[PDB]
């Protein structure tokens, strides 16, 4: 005749009773973070009546904890394989170190939350986002030595004709303008010490989606005898993101700020493969270092123009900036982070090198790069 209260963890009943008797209507309500499913519903509340033999007509309908299910994949980034999926669990998100990091990470911590989904104290539902670690090489590195690509990850080798360019991140390359005024599809390619003309299918190659020169550089009908070097600098947008890893790794930009200015006798590294190509053998990368000296050197050899948007490097004899490939990178310890680099110079000047080279200042150019980048995303 009377209906008894069962163990009730996991539920609330309205009306709660002592005893309940034939006819009496209990709305059951489950805690947050469980559920009862049946059919393609989780319900979270029900009725249930007293019969007229005691057993309630929904008696067997129990609340179980919600399942958030198996945690959503990051790219770039791995999710440590989950004690259980239930309401309440830990899940531990993580990104591919030491290649990428964690954007703002709330730590990678989700939990299994009571309305089913994983979810992260600062982030809410949103998932993390893993993205490239610039600036720092696996390896680290007279008239120039011989270099690993591990040295310089972040260097681009160009084809038609020979010439470089620096990763700056998944989907940018920066270069210098004389590099890319003649190719606006510019063949690219990463990740490998040696180059061999022949064997270029197994290195990894970049395909371009749109060039962007500085809209200061100075175009001319014949390029061959320029003398104007200003603003020598360009960009160029990856149809796909470039995966890093020990061979291929983007390089900083510098700051805006004026811990970012050169001293004289600061040190930077160039690196190439050289200014002569060769077509039959397989030729390794190389490397030298150089000190930053004033401007007003660069002048030996009508005639060339200098602005405060150049940076001169090296003096001495053996010094050899043909080194030292075109579009290049003059990497440069970082002020704040010794174990980093950046580029605070794209090597410039086309054919003219050697003993001192000229390269174009980059940060006065920070400004035009990323409204560059974030004007034309996706």
């Known amino acids: 005749m009377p209906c008894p209260k069962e163990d009730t963890p996991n539920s609330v009943w309205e009306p709660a009773k002592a005893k309940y008797v034939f006819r009496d209507v209990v709305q059951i309500t489950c805690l947050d973070g469980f559920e009862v499913v049946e059919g393609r519903v989780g319900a979270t509340s029900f009725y249930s009546t007293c019969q007229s033999n005691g057993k309630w007509s929904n008696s067997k309908l129990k609340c179980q904890p919600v399942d958030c299910g198996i945690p959503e994949s990051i790219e770039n980034g791995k999710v440590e394989d989950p004690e259980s999926t239930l309401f309440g669990s830990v899940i531990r998100y993580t990104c591919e170190e030491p290649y990428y990091y964690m954007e703002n990470g709330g730590?990678?911590?989700?939990?299994?939350?009571?309305?089913?989904?994983?979810?992260?104290?600062?982030?809410?539902?949103?998932?993390?986002?893993?993205?490239?670690?610039?600036?720092?090489?696996?390896?680290?590195?007279?008239?120039?030595?011989?270099?690993?690509?591990?040295?310089?990850?972040?260097?681009?080798?160009?084809?038609?004709?020979?010439?470089?360019?620096?990763?700056?991140?998944?989907?940018?390359?920066?270069?210098?303008?004389?590099?890319?005024?003649?190719?606006?599809?510019?063949?690219?390619?990463?990740?490998?010490t040696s180059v061999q003309t022949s064997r270029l299918a197994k290195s990894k190659m970049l395909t371009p989606e749109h060039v962007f020169i500085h809209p200061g550089w100075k175009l001319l009908e014949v390029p061959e005898g320029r003398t104007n070097f200003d603003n020598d600098i360009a960009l160029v947008r990856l149809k796909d993101p470039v995966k890093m890893g020990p061979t291929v790794s983007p390089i900083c930009l510098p700051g805006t700020s004026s811990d970012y200015n050169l001293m004289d006798g600061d040190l930077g590294l160039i690196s190439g493969w050289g200014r002569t190509e060769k077509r039959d053998r397989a030729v390794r990368l190389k490397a030298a270092r150089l000190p930053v000296a004033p401007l007003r050197k660069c002048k030996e050899v009508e005639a060339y123009v200098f602005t405060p948007n150049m940076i001169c490097a090296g003096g001495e004899k053996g010094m050899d900036s043909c080194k030292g490939d075109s579009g290049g990178a003059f990497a440069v310890q970082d002020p704040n982070d010794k174990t980093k680099f950046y580029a605070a110079g794209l090597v410039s000047w086309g054919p003219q090198c050697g003993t001192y080279g000229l390269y174009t200042r980059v940060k006065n150019y920070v400004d035009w790069i990323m409204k560059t980048m974030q004007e034309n995303s996706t």
Not at 126 to 144: D, T, Y
């Open 107 to 192: 730590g990678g911590e989700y939990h299994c939350a009571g309305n089913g989904s994983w979810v992260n104290e600062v982030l809410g539902p949103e998932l993390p986002k893993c993205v490239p670690v610039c600036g720092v090489p696996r390896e680290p590195f007279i008239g120039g030595s011989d270099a690993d690509i591990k040295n310089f990850p972040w260097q681009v080798f160009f084809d038609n004709p020979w010439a470089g360019g620096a990763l700056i991140n998944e989907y940018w390359v920066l270069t210098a303008a004389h590099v890319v005024e003649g190719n606006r599809e510019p063949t690219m390619y990463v990740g490998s």
